[PDB]
């Protein structure tokens, strides 16, 4: 899309309708006459386009109104309201921009942000952008959180997020322009090598993937068209449903062989009755011939009865011969028909063990995408964020994904090595109690007007709690935390002294031996300039490889590499790293998934902020004081770096609106 309308698409907004957010801030216009709505919609799209076309510089209200044309640059309070709206919710002037007018020296309000992960940083920068006192508390000795990059020498490999899913309306595209990221496309071709070490033949490789893709659609049919969503009270999981579809395809393969062979018996046995006539008729003909011969033996001249007898027997024998010839006619059709049916038997098996093992790799990939075993994923909802897909090739970051957070952390008050241990929020303010991660006895107290919590969902789910909330989080929020899924997928970094793989191939698979080990080192990435290979560990195997030393793991990697490229070809790696995301106590997981029994609605429940009870009974309802952000709170774009960043922008606008006031709604 292009024009002013490309700005609306690139900003995740319908170019020709007012959104519900926009209606909330501009009720007069949405409820007014169709002409006004179009004016507004243009002013919105046009401002977005301006910010987009150059995102390294602030878009001031002046700059904007300058470059509108009448009739649009006529009403200047409509322009001012629109520019303020966009700036507030991070649709313009977000990320890293030169400010034209430097920030006012005196700040209003005070906000503690827990975590300098990408979502934390994105709010922190916005809030400070809005003139607030913002301090981030980070347990780690580095920012970024789950956006980790490992650097040593010229080796550079990401242990966390490493892919940008398309620039088509992605906030990261604007960020990439703001902070140089070597963004290189990911070529889609992935060859699959089996346990022996031989590449799967292309004909088989295509045949399975279609079956795979064919199976996934069937579940979606079980879900939406047969409402197969509950079994014995427990809700059905994607894994369950895939089995009920593989079983029903193996059932069908059998029903198909039965009613085929059952056509052979129903014809073999027409033949049985036909041969019984034919052998009992060759017996009547044997006898009649004898009678006709004996009757013909009588020497003429004979009486007319003895002469009738010869003729009558001759006719009768001829009539029987007609019969027996018509029956070996019919015997010929059936003889061929049985050969036809035997010649075209139906498929022997639905899937071979080799075929099934290859399929099991396609399920590993799907347990990679969702960072969880397929049994856990909700059948109805696992793919509910599939409508909001960006458009474009997926990319990687050659310089490491760590630059984006570091870029964002510029100018922010970040207290590293500071584990928040208690959040305490009351009708009049909040205090956050943290310790120092190195000597934990040394205690810190932070007072503030509002606390924004970007704790990973896995941290939020820890029992007994890593962080205590005083007063305790209400049951609707905690229940949401139990229901939601937080999964895990780990990575292994392999640093060699020479490229010994196909350099024009970004990623190549390895097929497992079992279903149970389908995730164990199932996929490798060439993505960087240097000779670095990344091996994933997903599925049920991720949780289990965390109990196994790095040497045993790098061992299993070398062996797999040796099979695909030859024992002589792969040398020992110079530097090796393994990730343990579930073990890490600052994550306790990888990213969230829609677990069975959860829905997308839970992702909205996490985002809702918490409001404390009045200190004095009978006092007026207090302002909300605890706000949440992060990858587990944005329902439309969960488990992604862009989603985390969007969640941070969203809370900053809402927090600012609550404490600085929204003057753009009149």
């Amino acid at each position: 899309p292009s024009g002013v309308e490309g700005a609306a698409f690139q900003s995740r907004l319908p170019h020709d309708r007012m959104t519900s957010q926009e209606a909330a801030c501009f009720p007069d216009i949405i409820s007014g006459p169709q002409q006004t709505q179009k004016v507004f919609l243009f002013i919105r799209n046009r401002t977005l386009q301006l910010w987009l076309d150059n995102p390294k510089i602030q878009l001031t209200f002046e700059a904007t109104l300058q470059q509108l044309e009448a009739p649009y640059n006529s009403d200047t309070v409509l322009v001012h309201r629109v520019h303020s709206y966009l700036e507030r919710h991070g649709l313009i002037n977000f990320g890293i921009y030169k400010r034209i007018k430097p920030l006012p020296t005196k700040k209003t309000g005070k906000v503690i942000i827990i975590g300098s992960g990408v979502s934390g940083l994105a709010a922190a920068r916005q809030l400070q952008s809005f003139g607030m006192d913002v301090t981030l508390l980070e347990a780690r000795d580095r920012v970024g959180g789950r956006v980790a990059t490992f650097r040593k020498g010229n080796y550079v490999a990401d242990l966390g997020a490493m892919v940008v899913t398309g620039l088509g309306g992605n906030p990261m595209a604007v960020v990439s322009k703001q902070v140089n990221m070597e963004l290189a496309k990911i070529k889609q071709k992935c060859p699959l090598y089996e346990a022996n070490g031989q590449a799967v033949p292309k004909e088989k490789d295509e045949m399975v993937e279609q079956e795979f893709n064919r199976l996934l659609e069937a579940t979606s049919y079980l879900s939406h068209q047969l409402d197969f969503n509950v079994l014995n009270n427990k809700p059905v999981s994607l894994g369950q449903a895939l089995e009920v579809v593989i079983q029903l395809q193996e059932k069908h393969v059998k029903d198909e062989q039965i009613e085929h062979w059952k056509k052979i018996v129903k014809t073999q046995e027409e033949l049985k009755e036909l041969l019984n006539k034919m052998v009992n008729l060759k017996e009547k003909i044997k006898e009649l011939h004898q009678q006709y011969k004996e009757a013909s033996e009588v020497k003429p001249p004979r009486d007319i009865t003895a002469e009738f007898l010869v003729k009558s027997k001759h006719r009768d024998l001829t009539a029987l011969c007609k019969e027996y010839d018509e029956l070996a006619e019919t015997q010929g059709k059936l003889e061929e028909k049985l050969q036809e049916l035997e010649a075209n038997p139906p498929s022997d098996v639905y899937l071979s063990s080799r075929d099934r093992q290859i399929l099991d790799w396609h399920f590993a990939n799907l347990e990679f995408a969702n960072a969880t075993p397929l049994s856990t994923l909700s059948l109805k909802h696992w793919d509910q964020d599939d409508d909001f897909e960006f458009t474009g090739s997926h990319l990687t970051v050659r310089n490491g994904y760590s630059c984006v957070p570091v870029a964002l952390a510029e100018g922010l008050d970040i207290k590293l090595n500071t584990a928040v241990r208690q959040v305490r929020y009351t009708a009049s303010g909040c205090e956050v109690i943290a310790v120092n991660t190195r000597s934990t006895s040394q205690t810190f107290i932070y007072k503030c007007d509002a606390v924004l919590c970007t704790l990973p969902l896995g941290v939020l789910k820890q029992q007994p709690p890593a962080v205590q909330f005083v007063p305790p989080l209400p049951e609707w929020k905690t229940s949401a935390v139990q229901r939601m899924g937080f999964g895990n997928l780990n990575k292994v970094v392999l640093c060699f002294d020479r490229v010994f793989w196909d350099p024009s191939v970004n990623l190549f698979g390895h097929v497992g031996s079992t279903t149970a080990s389908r995730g164990e080192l199932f996929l490798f990435w060439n993505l960087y300039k240097a000779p670095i290979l990344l091996a994933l560990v997903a599925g049920e195997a991720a949780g289990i490889m965390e109990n196994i030393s790095d040497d045993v793991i790098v061992g299993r990697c070398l062996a797999i590499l040796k099979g695909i490229f030859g024992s002589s070809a792969v040398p020992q790696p110079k530097e090796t790293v393994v990730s343990r995301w579930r073990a890490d106590p600052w994550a306790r997981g990888s990213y969230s998934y829609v677990a069975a029994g959860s829905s997308g609605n839970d992702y909205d429940l996490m985002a809702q902020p918490i409001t404390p009870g009045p200190s004095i009974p009978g006092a007026p309802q207090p302002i909300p004081r605890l706000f949440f952000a992060g990858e587990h709170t944005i329902r439309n774009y969960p488990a992604t770096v862009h989603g985390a960043l969007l969640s941070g922008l969203r809370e900053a606008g809402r927090i600012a609106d609550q404490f600085l006031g929204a003057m753009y709604t009149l």
Partner: protein
């Protein structure tokens, strides 16, 4: 609105493979037995019918008989009249057989022959006797 072509899914089918734990595995075992059942039933009629095939070895070539290519005449030699009556006694109204016996009389000639000689050869009487068998 419809399943992927070639993928078989039936509500009926689905309940039956979910109704308990091992129900899917149980259902396939019968089909595995229903299959072996019908499969050796084949080798057993394939066996029965291979014996009957052997019994026909030679067909009926030795019992066959050559063709009387004989020009179909019009006059009724007293010989042929008598073959007629005896044919009517053994064959009732099957003129094709009656004509086949006599050898040189067409079916119509036989057909109208009954009316002409019917009084003369008591052929009602003969026919009822043919009805008695």
């Amino acid at each position: 609105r419809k399943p992927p072509k070639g993928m078989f899914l039936s509500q009926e089918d689905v309940e039956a493979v979910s109704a308990n734990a091992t129900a899917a595995t149980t259902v396939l075992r019968q089909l595995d037995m229903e299959l072996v059942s019908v499969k050796r039933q084949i080798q057993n009629i394939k066996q029965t019918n291979s014996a009957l095939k052997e019994k026909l070895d030679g067909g009926i070539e030795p019992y066959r008989l050559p063709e009387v290519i004989q020009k179909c005449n019009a006059r009724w030699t007293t010989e042929e009249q008598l073959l007629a009556v005896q044919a009517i006694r053994k064959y009732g109204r099957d003129f094709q057989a009656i004509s086949d016996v006599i050898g040189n009389k067409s079916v119509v000639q036989v057909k109208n022959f009954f009316v002409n000689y019917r009084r003369r050869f008591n052929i009602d009487e003969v026919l009822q006797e043919w009805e008695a068998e």
